[PDB]
Structures are given as C-alpha cells and as structure tokens.
C-alpha cells in the first residue's frame, strides 16, 4: 500500500510536472514504443512516427488519467473504475505491458526532474505506478 510518505512524495513530484504532464505522457509512450516494440501491436491504427499528433493526443489523455489518480490517491479503485473496465473489456491489453509503460514513465520523470527524482521519491513513484497498474488490471478475469 501507499504510505503517507509515499502520497506526499507523489503529490510533490507530480506537482512539479504541472503543465508538462501531457508532453511527458507523449514521451513515455514514445520511449515505450522504441524500447519494447511489441507494445505497438496495440496501436496499429496509430501514426507512431516521431511527433505524431495521435501520440501527442494520446499522451495527454494518459497524463490526465494519472493526474486524476494523484487527485484521488485515497480512492484510486473508484477514481479509475472506468479506465479499468475499458482496459479489461474493450482493449484487453496484456497485463505485462503496464509494467513496461510504468518503467518508461519513471525514466521520463527521471530525465525531467533531476532535483526531485531522489531515491525515496523514485521508490514512491514506482509503488504508485504499480498501484495504478493493479487497478487497471483488476477486472481482467
């Protein structure tokens, strides 16, 4: 579970992201597509070329959902219900991919928040992302 300390770390780190969340969401996706090409099998309908608007468009929706989870850190199961149903019943994204995107989001944050990305915050962000993945995968079967 997320400790009070964990919650503080996340709010502060996400806090700093601010208005760049969407740009960071886009970048995380891009890093994921490049490092783990199997993930692209889920976006066959997308232009995955560099600077694709589709990717920019999608990165923002992903960032918004994370921004929403931070906002409702104490009720994540409910705040993300909808996204969980969608991923489980419509998209049917294999669960391993959540870990790949999480990893890419950490790298993205690390690359942009040098001062904030401390060992303790890095641990809190990992646990957080793991919690979000867990929720989004809870209604799979």
């Amino acid at each position: 579970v997320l400790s009070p300390a964990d919650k503080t770390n996340v709010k502060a780190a996400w806090g700093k992201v601010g208005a760049h969340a969407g740009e960071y969401g886009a970048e995380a996706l891009e890093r994921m597509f490049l490092s783990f090409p199997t993930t692209k099998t889920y976006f066959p309908h997308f232009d995955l070329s560099h600077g694709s608007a589709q990717v920019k468009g999608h990165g923002k929706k992903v960032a918004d959902a994370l921004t929403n989870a931070v906002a409702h850190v104490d009720d994540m199961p409910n705040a993300l219900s909808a996204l969980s149903d969608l991923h489980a019943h419509k998209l049917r994204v294999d669960p391993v991919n959540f870990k790949l995107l999480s990893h890419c989001l950490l790298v993205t944050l690390a690359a942009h928040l040098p001062a904030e990305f401390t060992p303790a915050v890095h641990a809190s962000l990992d646990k957080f992302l793991a919690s979000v993945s867990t929720v989004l995968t809870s209604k799979y079967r």
Binding site: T39, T41, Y42, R92, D94, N97, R141
Partner: protein, 146 residues
C-alpha cells in the same frame, strides 16, 4: 537449442504419442478460457461466451490443430527454430498485430495440456525439457517483431 541429446530425446519421444487433434483444440481452448483477453484476436470464430462455447467451437478446434501442426514442424527443426518461424513471426507481427507475450501464455497452457493428458508420464525432467522448447518456440515467434 540448448537442449541436451537427452532432453532432445525426451521431447521427441513424448511428442510421438501426441494426438495433435485433441491437444491443439484443448491448448487453444484453455488459452481463451484461462486468459479471456486473448479472445480479442478470435472474434470471428463465434460465441466464446463460455468454457463450453469455447471448447465446442470448431473454429477453435480447427485452428488449434493448425497451430500444433506448426509446433510439430518446429520440433523437427530444434536447431533452427528462428529460421523455421521467421515467416510466421512477421505474420503475427505485421498482419495479425498479436502481442508477443501471448506466445508465452500459450506455451505454459501447452505444458498444462501435456500434463493433463500424459499424467505420471509427464515427469519433472520431461516438463523441464518442454519448458525449454516452449520458451524457444515463443522466442522464435517474437524474433521478427519490430
């Protein structure tokens, strides 16, 4: 592969006793039942609403046999699974858009089907050799992913 002649012989010897028809249908069927998210690729086969609808589905059974068949040929080319599945790899990637992780799910389901069928005969050592083959196969099928 990194199969010992002994492991090679174990795999090969058991395979000889395999009813491809029954095993292929069962392996594909259990895949769709156990990891329902894999049904996303077989929408056109029909009603997969239930275990029973899935196991009885002829399209599932028929495709399972096509799948175990390819598997069989790979067992005939264990020293070059890569070259044997190159065409099938690009198809699964470029045409089918199938997450390569599904190759690993299927491999494990297969092991469970061989255990179910062979019972006592599917010993820890035989299982160990088959774990290596399924991993090999799964790697070969994902090799041309880009």
């Amino acid at each position: 592969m990194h199969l010992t002649p002994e492991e090679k012989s174990a795999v090969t010897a058991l395979w000889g006793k395999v009813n491809v028809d029954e095993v292929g249908g069962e392996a594909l069927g259990r895949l769709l039942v156990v990891y329902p998210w894999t049904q996303r690729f077989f929408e056109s086969f029909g009603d997969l609403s239930t275990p029973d609808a899935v196991m009885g589905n002829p399209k599932v059974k028929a495709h399972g046999k096509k799948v175990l068949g390819a598997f069989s040929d790979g067992l005939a080319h264990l020293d070059n699974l890569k070259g044997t599945f190159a065409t099938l790899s690009e198809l699964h990637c470029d045409k089918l858009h199938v997450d390569a992780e599904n190759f690993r799910l299927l491999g494990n389901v297969l092991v469970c089907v061989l255990a179910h069928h062979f019972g006592k005969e599917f010993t820890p050592p035989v299982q160990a050799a088959y774990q290596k083959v399924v991993a090999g196969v799964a790697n070969a099928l994902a090799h041309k992913y880009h």
